[PDB]
Write a protein that binds this ligand. Sequence first.
Ligand code: MET
Length: 518
Amino acid sequence: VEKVFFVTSPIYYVNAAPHIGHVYSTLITDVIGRYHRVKGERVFALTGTDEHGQKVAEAAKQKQVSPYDFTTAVAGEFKKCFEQMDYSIDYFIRTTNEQHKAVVKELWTKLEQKGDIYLGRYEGWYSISDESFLTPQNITDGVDKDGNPCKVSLESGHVVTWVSEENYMFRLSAFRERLLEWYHANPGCIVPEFRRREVIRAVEKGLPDLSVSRARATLHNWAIPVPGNPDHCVYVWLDALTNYLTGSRLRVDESGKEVSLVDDFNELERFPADVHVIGKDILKFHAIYWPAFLLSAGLPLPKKIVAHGWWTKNVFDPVEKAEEFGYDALKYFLLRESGFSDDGDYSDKNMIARLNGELADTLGNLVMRCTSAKINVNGEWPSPAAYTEEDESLIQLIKDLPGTADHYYLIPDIQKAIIAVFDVLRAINAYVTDMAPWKLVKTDPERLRTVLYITLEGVRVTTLLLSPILPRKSVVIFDMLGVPEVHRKGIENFEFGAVPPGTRLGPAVEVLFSKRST
Ligand code: MET
């Protein structure tokens, strides 16, 4: 069933300036988006800011400025940061947007009409930093920035507070079975698997109803009013989760401004999300509440939620490190160094190690070998002669690479997709070392034709599959190889031999990735 591939990042709270956490989440969103564009699919990637709520209002009162001003300013910083990082996100959404508020009111009303929202009370703990209702088993003793004995969350370690309010409640308990049916029927719907097992055991243990409104005094009136009850506001999370639905209904122009809000989501072919990218800290909201809301309203459910191991909500400034080591290099490192854990070190030591060892020595050196005037004397893709069994063993790897990488990208597991490409790059280097084409120019020109061609095609296919990870460097690489534009995109060009012999190399000026001191 052909649709627009819809991939999202979380929308980030604007209480604080952007940092690595948001960058990483949005990078993963971007890379997925980019891969599906390379595949030749229609894409809509979405990122944004979560601007309402008690936490943002209190962050604004701290800086002593009006919530409206504060949110607009920080949202501007988020846009500036994502432009600087050179992402390719299709739209940046803000929950302050009037069209978003409209959607939230439609959704609220639907849920209320379906009989799934009732007037009740919430009496219990709450973390204002996490905007999360917690049960007594999720709290314990700690300290506030005062150094005073207070209660704190087990999840996050943020300070908790008792809440006792008459609140609109969502009948989440009613969706326990349907959610379990969903998890079991679609065993890939939550990645990675151990996070899937967590959600299941949680929902198995039973679900309480969820407070979806709060007394307007509590939130300092910085939130969306409940339809037909201006004393209550919509829970920042029902507000925030609904962005995905809103994004799927916005027509967007050349510039990137929202220009229209279609009534029916089907009109734009985006909903539901194919991949929701999130951090592990917000799994419950995306894997439990969000699908229950959609079930209540009769909306389609997302296909995949992927939860990585950072926290969405000693310094590491990504814009700064990118200026030092290069943008693509940094992205690669972040994507390669870490899978589904915090573990893996992000030090300058290991950062330089990967730059020099993989990007420069493995990829960079290989690109210079197959384009060198010394080795490639004609500056063109040569026509291969007969293939040895060794030739054919490398070709087999190059041919198998796209299918393997495709699966990894789709899981999605971007680390394993990188590892798989680089395994082929390591192979090509070994092959080149064995064949020693520098010697062959003098000894056996017919043999060189064959070696060089395989090497070039290996470099091209690896580079194509790495183009979502190294979007600027892939282009430079292709420019060196003289690969025509049409051959830089599309599944047709995952195939071995897509670029014909006689294709001329691009001119020289020039090192691809420069190495650095330890
Ligand atoms: C619907 S995504 C909401 C995520 C939350 N605002 C955060 O910053 O972590």
